[PDB]
Amino acid sequence: TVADKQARLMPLFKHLTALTREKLPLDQRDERLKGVGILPRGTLFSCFHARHLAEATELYVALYGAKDFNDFIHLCEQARQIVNEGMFVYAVSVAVLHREDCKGITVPPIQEVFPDRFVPAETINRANKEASNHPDQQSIVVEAEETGNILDPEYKLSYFREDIGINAHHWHWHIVYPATWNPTVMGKEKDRKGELFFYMHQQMCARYDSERLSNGLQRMIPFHNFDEPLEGYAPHLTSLVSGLQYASRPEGYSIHDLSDVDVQDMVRWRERILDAINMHYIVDKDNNKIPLDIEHGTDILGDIIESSDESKNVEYYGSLHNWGHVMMANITDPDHRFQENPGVMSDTSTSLRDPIFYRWHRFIDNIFQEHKKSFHPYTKEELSFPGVEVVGVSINSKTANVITTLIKESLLELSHGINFGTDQSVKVKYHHLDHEPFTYNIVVENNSGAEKHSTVRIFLAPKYDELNNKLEPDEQRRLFIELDKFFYTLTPGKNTIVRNHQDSSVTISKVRTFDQLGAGEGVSEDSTEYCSCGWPEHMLIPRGSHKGMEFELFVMLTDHDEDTVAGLSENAVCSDAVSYCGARDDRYPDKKAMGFPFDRKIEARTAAEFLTPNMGLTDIKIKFHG
Amino acid sequence: TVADKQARLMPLFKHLTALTREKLPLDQRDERLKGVGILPRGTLFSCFHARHLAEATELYVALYGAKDFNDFIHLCEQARQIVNEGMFVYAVSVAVLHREDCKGITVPPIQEVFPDRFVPAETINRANKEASNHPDQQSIVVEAEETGNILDPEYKLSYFREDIGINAHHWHWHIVYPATWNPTVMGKEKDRKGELFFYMHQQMCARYDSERLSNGLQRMIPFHNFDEPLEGYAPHLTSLVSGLQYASRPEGYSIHDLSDVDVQDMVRWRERILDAINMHYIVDKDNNKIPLDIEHGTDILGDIIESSDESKNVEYYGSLHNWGHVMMANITDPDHRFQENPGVMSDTSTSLRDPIFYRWHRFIDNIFQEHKKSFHPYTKEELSFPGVEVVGVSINSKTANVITTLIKESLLELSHGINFGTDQSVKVKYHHLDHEPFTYNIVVENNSGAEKHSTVRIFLAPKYDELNNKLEPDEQRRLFIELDKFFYTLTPGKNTIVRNHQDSSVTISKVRTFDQLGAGEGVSEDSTEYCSCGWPEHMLIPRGSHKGMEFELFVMLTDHDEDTVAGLSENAVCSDAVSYCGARDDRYPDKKAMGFPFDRKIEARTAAEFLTPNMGLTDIKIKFHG
Amino acid sequence: VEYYGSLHNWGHVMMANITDPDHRFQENPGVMSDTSTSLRDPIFYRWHRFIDNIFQEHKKSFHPYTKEELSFPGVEVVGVSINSKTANVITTLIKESLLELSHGINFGTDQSVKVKYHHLDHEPFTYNIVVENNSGAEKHSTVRIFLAPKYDELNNKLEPDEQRRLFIELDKFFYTLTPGKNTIVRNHQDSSVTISKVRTFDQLGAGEGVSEDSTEYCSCGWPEHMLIPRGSHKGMEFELFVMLTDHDEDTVAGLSENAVCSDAVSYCGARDDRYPDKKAMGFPFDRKIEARTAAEFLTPNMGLTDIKIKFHG
């Protein structure tokens, strides 16, 4: 049954570190396996580096090529002793999702699988220590919160950057859309992956910026110059696997060439890209030019920038984004003389924690923005949905139009990830931001005679600048974060549409634990994305401040008939989280450009001026509770 | 009995990390304890930093103050609960070494107490992992040697720098001569501690230089300028106490001010010292001037430079040497914002491993050298011992005049230091340099009618330079390493004096393991120096090369009557290792300046010209075996 | 030219007048300015590696070589041996030599002014290659011999990708193989890379019969003493690579001259003739190698023999 299948998968995931020791007399028998084992087990695996992705692609394709599920389990089992734990938890995990007769099927928790990435060196330590200190079945609980001197104001952001859910999501997203993805081999293609790459990262930056403003900090600035020295960050993460940890980065580093790539190359790549935008065409390998069409342009750019296998010219355009992660990651030891592990930037699970991440991503976002700039603005025609008027919006909470945010304690179970020994469970306690539940009530007047179908789009943007209160829509575009997107039908006359925050399309409703999975639930029967992907729920709104920071609440209704695509896909599957994740094996459900209406330049000085009749702005307050 | 006493001490030393959790309702009861407990438990303890040293001193005093041994155990037991563990080990070891009541007693092994400092992050992790992986009484053995790509040639030196014995010695030496040492409080004074400070460190540098030359590398250069960027070093040590590890140092940034101290603070202190040398006087607090006497000068300088409590002016002169360790140690995070642990430079146990250590110490050595320069050279009168002539010297080994050096495997038992759990023992296997045993035969002609008493001094110096073969005695002075010093009586006529390498005054004959100590032997019962201090035996001669590098073997005989001091001290106690360690509670047994005849400038172009009749040079070869 | 410029040449010029870029001080340029002197400056290598890199990127764009391209079927290389005083060891030493100044600088009264200098040199050696010709008929093969260092800067690692940069060409020559086992012996003196002899002014005033062609005559070719690297006293280990290829494929047809300056074909080419080898210069080394060890790369018509080079002080 499916349940049995789930059980088999969970053990593929257990004791990965330990699983090493090949115990294989000969790989030759495993002809399928020949293409791998090239990266040694203990070594850190880089999500960004090309070679690490070459070997990884080869693992995927063999586990897609494995004939049936049983065959799948077998090959998977053999090669995670020989082909290394670090890369093989990657080549298995991504494969584990996508090859067909797998379905039913969650992946064990990333946080749970590698607790060391989620929690600090100290609370890893203490817990391991307690296990040894007194042998006893009794459970161990450790509070990760610590006590320390809070020197850097960046620390304030830690609730966002360090959040477990955020890191997990980032890991999962890359799994759903792998850079290595080869559509020919799989046969299936990921719709608009390049564009999604752009959108997801942009949102992370946008959301990040809202945190800084909530904090009273200015918006992050891009890593526009390569010459500039980076700010330091020390992760305090250990790798349980070995004694090694992610190397910390001191202050004040100018950029160093790596054997693999030189900084100059990075510059040269970026200048090409920025030029190809201006030129409005890119050059394919064939030396043909493809236009940066309005429809296609973002996607093509996304593939080139990341860059994915899909890039029209890998050789000329290079892979700017990925190399950025690599270069930043080994700033400490570019040359590799000193033999130190890379920083957090190397891993999709960890990278969000470093503040540098935002600087780089804003830089890349800028590239996309230049392209967007080339496009013409939106006419009333494009925006408006005639006959529909938005009367008002209200947010209901304990106090209307105010959302309250607080910190909540939570526990993570280490036992699946690290050797438990005698103890039944070792849990680490951490705290994260959370907010009260709320609902939206939108009153819409349907002037038309017949029932209409509308897509409701809701975004949140900070009212205040660093100067003083200034709702300049051009700037707002960067800041706006997507709260929700959903379909509703309106009858003629007045209508009130109520939606609850829980329903939010952006967030993951729930991630099942190992324990949940061993059980066997029906939420439904899905994938690496299953409970994993989606933005985390606690994270839905920015922290705000004790004072109650003012944010613009924007609701827009668009014609659904226009917005939806027609086609024939599946049952109700992982679609909760469509806004950032997309739909399983389906085309992106919205015709509009991701981020619409915000994606293109806004002529108006004030946001209010921008509004059409099917748009509305309600100012609400977010107040944090200490 | 003494044995019982030993047993009590060993547990003071066990599970130090764990010993935390105060379990004290109130410190107020412990009035004695009020002074200590500022430094937090987990934090790293700095041997160099003044504030840390102050706490440590406060702790020792309480231990010294303890009325009886039982009282000593009690306060220690209680103090260990609150105080930082590193400080605790430091304070206790000092107490054990000096306090009479402890006429019983070795200190548990430093390597054994903190195995994590001696062995790498990987083999620490491995033995811990194996312990958890399969529970079983069975013993675990891990080979620390690894497999890696050898990028830096500095790696070649690792046998010397990384050596367990060397690190242990350095720890112990600082314990015997603490910087904090206050003679008034103890009542007793450490004879010539300032000079010894100078001599010991100079020897470490000199010995280090011989390794580089054996390697074919040039001699180390001093940290002559503070502006210059440092070479990076990654220790790969994870401090078992914590999940944190010693922070690695990447390549190249000029020096950063710490909150505690500035760089123009540092520089100023250096100019003061170098000035006062030139002026031939230093200024006391009283604003009186004390002359840099020939007899006293090195000692006074040593106290000021280190600087010890003994410094005649702490505020004017500062503490250059110690601050150097601190500044280098937290180069990665001067400001303390990023909250990272210090590097190896912070600890006496670890500091030798970093190559920077030598650069700094040569710098300080230079300071001493300038002082030495001010002194006049030695006349034939001072050097010569009339009537005595040295006919020849021969070294006996498998092949005469050739010493063979090889690598030997050894194991270290982790169990005392880290939580063992079920396993009986976890041992880590490491390799170290070692040499064949050899003896010296010196033929001396005693022209005089009566029997004479002579001190035989033996040194080794490299023949080859970085250019070609050039025995320029001035340069040689830096390089010469002390093999042995001993007293012999010569009758009239020809005499042959034979001495074995094992007897060497420079080296520690044996360090007893916590296991041996678990029983009860009879080397006798003195303390932290016991088996600990002394230079390690395997280390006695430089590695040399496969080719058989040529070294000058220098033997000099001096009039013992002149050399010895008269006084009334103890039974045969820790005197094996007199050359570098001194004698327990005794005045340094040799009148001559440490390093004599090498300490003062040599006029001659060639070493041979320097020789008097009671001196001799024999060229021998050291050949390494792969 | 107006777009792509002249990068290499300008590099020499710029480096040469680093001391006085302005030409205000009216200094002379450094050694980099002259083809005769430029090799002496260590900078030369840095720049040339830079330019070499440019070529390498181009080479990178090309696909690797299949077994098909490399292999010469029916031919198998059994073994190679180098004969010297001690087999498989080449000895290198320093030799004194004299140069006569008189033609170059005003001699005045003196008959001759000679300056004595020392240079590296090695003992003569020969190669013996055993090849099995499986085919029924006689074949024609081009024997290609290269030398590459075994040791890296770290430890012993015959990573063929890296080796490509290091490999130096010892010799290229044509041999005919009959069916059955064959032993081909070649002497170092014959090496295609080196100039057999440069005649002095004195030699020339005389009148000899190597033949009469020109600036390349005795001049060009790599110098003979230079043929192998110095090695070390310990006897450094080098990979000796021999490959045989189908000559019919390798040669071009055409109608050119008598036996002329062709001794030194490997680096010099042939006088007024097309380059005699179809293969890319540096083949098989020019394109990227996937293999882990060099050994994996080998086809049946290739062979590696490890020899030692030991310098004599």
3 state SS for A360-420: HHHHHHHHHHHHHHHCCCCCHHHHCCCCEEEEEEEEECCCCCEEEEEEEEEEEECCCCCCC
Contact C92, C309 (CB under 8 A): yes
- The contacts of residue C206 (CB under 8 Å, 6+ apart) are none
Alpha carbon distance B170, A344 (integer Å): 36
3-state secondary structure (DSSP) of residue B160: helix
- DSSP 3-state of A160: helix
Other C-beta atoms closer than 10 Å to the C-beta of B269 total 21
DSSP state letter for A245: B
Residues of A in contact with B248 (CB under 8 A): 247, 332, 338, 340
| Residues near B25 by beta carbon (within 8 Å), at least 6 away in sequence | none
Please provide residue A140's backbone torsions phi and psi, each rounded to the nearest 5 degrees: -115, 135
CA distance B19 to chain C (A): 44
Side-chain-facing half-sphere of C35: CA atoms under 13 Å? 2
**Alpha-carbon torsion, ordered C58, C63, C66, C70, to 10 deg:** -10
Cα B73 from Cα B63, distance rounded (Å)? 9
The amino acid present at A58, given as its one-letter code, is E
Match 């526009």 to its residue by tokens. Answer: A224
Phi, psi of A527 (to 5 degrees): -150, -155
Helix/strand/coil for C115: strand
- The letter for the amino acid at C205 is G
Amino acid at B119: V
Residues 6+ apart with CB under 8 A from B190: B176, B177, B181, B183, B196
At residue B131's C-alpha, the angle toward residues B129 and B134, to 5°, is: 100
- Residue B100 is classified by DSSP as G
Chain A residues touching B257 at Cβ < 8 A: none
Q: Please name the member of A18, A121, A240 whose beta carbon is closest to the beta carbon of B242.
A: A121
Of B441, B381, B366, residue with least CA distance to B618: B441
A-facing residues of B in 102-121 (CB < 8 A) are: 120-121
Cβ within 8 Å of residue B231, ≥6 positions away: B154, B251, B252, B355, B356
Could you list the residues of B known to form a binding site for Cu cation, using ranges.
Answer: 170, 174, 201, 321, 325, 361
B43 touches chain A (CB under 8 A): no
Describe chain B by its helix, strand, coil percentages, rounded to 5.
Answer: 35, 20, 45
Nearest to C154 among B149, B546, B547 (CB): B149
- Chain A nearest-CA distance from B419, in A, is 6
In single-letter form, the type of residue at position C134 comes to N
Amino acid at B167: N
Q: Which residue has the tokens 């010209």?
A: B609
Q: How many CB pairs under 8 A join B and C?
A: 9
Q: Which residue, chain included where needed, has tokens 């110690």?
A: B322
- Could you give the CA distance from residue A339 to residue B234 in angstroms, rounded to a whole number? 7
Neighbours of chain B (3+ CB pairs under 8 A): A, C
Distance between CA atoms of C19 and C23, rounded to whole angstroms?
9
- The number of angstroms, rounded, from the C-alpha of B300 to the middle of its chain's C-alpha atoms is 20
Asked whether C80 and C240 are in contact (CB, 8 A), the reply is: yes
Residues from chain B that touch C233, judged by Cβ atoms under 8 A, are 547
The torsion defined by the Cα of C221, C224, C228 and C233, in degrees rounded to 10, comes to: -150
Q: Identify whether the C-beta of residue C161 lies closer than 8 Å to the C-beta of residue C288.
A: yes
Which residues of A are known binding-site members for Cu cation? 170, 174, 201, 321, 325, 361
Closest CA to A431 of A119, A170, A206, A109: A119
User: Burial level of A221, CB count in 10 A (0-12/13-18/19+)?
Assistant: exposed
Q: How far is B28 from chain A (nearest CA, A)?
A: 24
Please give the structure tokens belonging to residue B73: 């155990």
Burial class (CB in 10 A: 0-12, 13-18, 19+), A369: middle
Neighbours of C252 (CB within 10 A): 11
Q: C284: cis peptide before it, omega within 30°?
A: yes
Q: Which of B145, B146, B147, B149 to mutate to test the interface with C (most CBs of C within 10 A)?
A: B149
Amino acid identity of residue A294, one-letter, is I
Q: Strand A439-446: give its sheet, edge to edge.
A: A388-396, A439-446, A493-500
Q: How many CA atoms lie within 13 A of C286 on its CB side?
A: 13
- Three-state SS at B43: coil
What one-character DSSP code corresponds to residue B13? Answer: H
Rama region for C88: left / alpha / beta (φ>0; ψ in -120 to 50; rest): left
Binding-site annotation, residues of A: 170, 174, 201, 321, 325, 361
Helices of type H across B402-554:
473-479, 514-519
Residue of B93, B84, B94 lying closest to B19 (CA atoms): B84
Of B42, B135, B340, the CB nearest to A248: B340
In degrees and rounded to multiples of 5, residue A155 shows phi and psi of -60, -35
Q: Nearest 10 degrees: CA dihedral of A327, A332, A337, A338?
A: -150
Pairing of strands C89-100, C302-311: parallel
Q: How far from A333 is each of A165, A234, A255, A299, B300, CA to CA, in Å?
A: 30, 15, 11, 34, 43
What is the Cα–Cα distance from A306 to A320, expressed in whole angstroms? 6
Q: Is A21 on the interface with B (CB under 8 A)?
A: no
Q: Is A193 exposed, middle or buried (0-12, 13-18, 19+ CB in 10 A)?
A: buried
Q: Is B147 helix (H, G, I), strand (E, B) or coil?
A: coil
Q: Most B CBs within 10 Å: which of C151, C152, C154, C156, as the mutation test of the B interface?
A: C154
Which amino acid does the sequence have at A374? S
Tokens read off for B578: 């007199």
Q: How many CB pairs below 8 Å do chains A and B form together?
A: 121
| Binding-site positions of B | 170, 174, 201, 321, 325, 361
**Residue C295 distance to chain B (closest CA, Å):** 21
> Taking CB atoms and an 8 Å cutoff, what residues of chain C touch B149?
154-155
Find out whether C278 and C247 touch, Cβ atoms under 8 Å.
Answer: no
Closest-CA residue of chain B to A15: B133
Separation in Å, CA of B110 to nearest CA in chain A: 21
DSSP state of A89: H
Structure tokens at B45: 């303890």
Q: Does B151 touch chain C (CB under 8 A)?
A: yes
Closest partner residue to B150 among C155, C233, C234, by Cβ?
C155
A234 touches chain B (CB under 8 A): yes
Nearest residue of B to residue C154 by CA position? B150
**Which of A42, A247, A248 lies at the smallest CB-CB distance from B338?**
A248
CB proximity under 8 Å: A 532-591 to B: none
Measured between alpha carbons, how far is A396 from A439 in angstroms, rounded to an integer?
5
Q: CA of B150: which chain C residue's CA is closest?
A: C154
Q: Closest Cα to residue A269, out of A312, A304, A223? A: A304
Residue B624 β-bridge partners: B405
Phi/psi for A521 (5° steps) reads: -105, -175
Decide if A548 contacts A402 (C-beta within 8 A).
yes
For every residue of A300-346, DSSP letters joined together read HHHHHHHT-TT-S-HHHH--HHHHHHHHHHTSS-SS-SS-----GGG
How far apart CA B225 and CA B359 sit, in angstroms, is 11
CB count within 10 Å of CB A148 equals: 8
Cα(A413)–Cα(A511) distance, integer angstroms: 14
- The CA-CA-CA angle for residues B169, B171, B177, to 5°, reads 100
CB neighbour list of residue C290: distance below 8 Å, 6 or more residues apart: C64, C161
Binary contact (B122, A243; C-beta < 8 A): yes
Q: Are B236 and B120 in contact (CB under 8 A)?
A: yes
Half-sphere exposure of B88 (CA within 13 A, CB side): 30
Q: Is residue C265 within 8 Å of residue C172, measured between CB atoms? A: yes
Query: Cα A501 vs. chain centroid, distance in angstroms?
Result: 20
The SS3 call for residue A97 is helix
Buried b (16+ CB within 10 A) or exposed e, A101-136: ebbbbbbbbbbbbbbbbbbbbbbbbbbbbbbbeeee
Task: Confirm if B544 and B433 have CB atoms less than 8 A apart.
Answer: no
Structure tokens belonging to residue B35: 């002074």
Q: A455 and A499 in contact (C-beta within 8 Å)?
A: no
- Please list every residue in chain B whose beta carbon sits closer than 8 Å to the beta carbon of residue A241: 125
Q: Which amino acid is at A610?
A: F
C-alpha count within 13 angstroms, C-beta hemisphere, residue B334: 18
Chain A nearest-CA distance from B122, in A, is 5
Which residues of A are known catalytic residues? 306
Other C-beta atoms within 10 Å of B559: how many? 17
Q: How far apart are CA A460 and CA A555, in angstroms?
A: 9
- Reference C245, options C280, C271, C288, C273; nearest CA is C280
**What does DSSP say about strands C236-246 and C302-311: parallel, antiparallel, or unpaired?**
antiparallel
Q: How far apart are CA B622 and CA B463, in angstroms?
A: 11
| Enclosing H/E stretch for B426 | strand B426-435
Partner chains of A (3+ C-beta pairs under 8 Å): B
Give the integer Cα–Cα distance in Å for C217 and C211: 9
Q: For residue B546, what is the nearest residue in chain C, using CA coordinates?
A: C234
State phi, psi for A506 to the nearest 5 degrees: -75, -25
Chain A residues close to B419, C-beta within 8 Å: 129, 132-133
Would you tell me how many other CB atoms lie within 10 Å of the CB of residue B132? 18
- Distance, in Å, from the CA atom of B513 to the CA atom of B412, rounded to the nearest integer, reads 10
Residue B54 to residue B60: CA distance in whole angstroms: 10
**Cα–Cα dist B389/B387, whole Å:** 6
Instruction: Chain B: give the shortest CA distance to residue A577, in Å.
Output: 36
> Is A254 at the interface with chain B, CB within 8 A?
no
Separation between Cα atoms, residue C128 and residue C186, nearest integer Å:
7
CB contact under 8 A, B151 and A122: no
| Contact criterion met (CB below 8 Å) for B118 and B111 | yes
CA distance B160 to chain A (A): 18
- Residue A220: both structure tokens together: 């992050």
> How far is C-alpha B85 from the chain's CA centre?
22
Resolution (A): 6.8
Please say whether the beta carbons of A73 and A11 come within 8 A: no
* Cβ(C126)–Cβ(C83) below 8 Å: yes
Q: Are B163 and B432 in contact (CB under 8 A)?
A: yes
The one catalytic residue in B306, B482, B525, B537 is B306
**Selected residue of B21, B248, B335, B344 to mutate for chain A interface (largest A Cβ count, 10 A):** B248
The candidate with the shortest Cα–Cα distance to C33, out of C18, C51, C11, C12, is C12
Q: How many CB atoms lie within 10 A of CB A176?
A: 22
In chain B, residues with a C-beta closer than 8 Å to the C-beta of A333 are 232, 234, 250-251
Q: State the pairing for strand pair A615-624/B493-500.
A: unpaired
CB-nearest partner of C154 from B151, B546, B547: B151
Cβ within 8 Å of residue B212, ≥6 positions away: B157, B218, B219, B220
| Amino acid letter, residue C126 | T
Q: How far is CA B332 from CA B120, B351, C303, in A?
A: 21, 16, 51
Answer whether B133 sits within 8 Å of A251, measured CB to CB. no
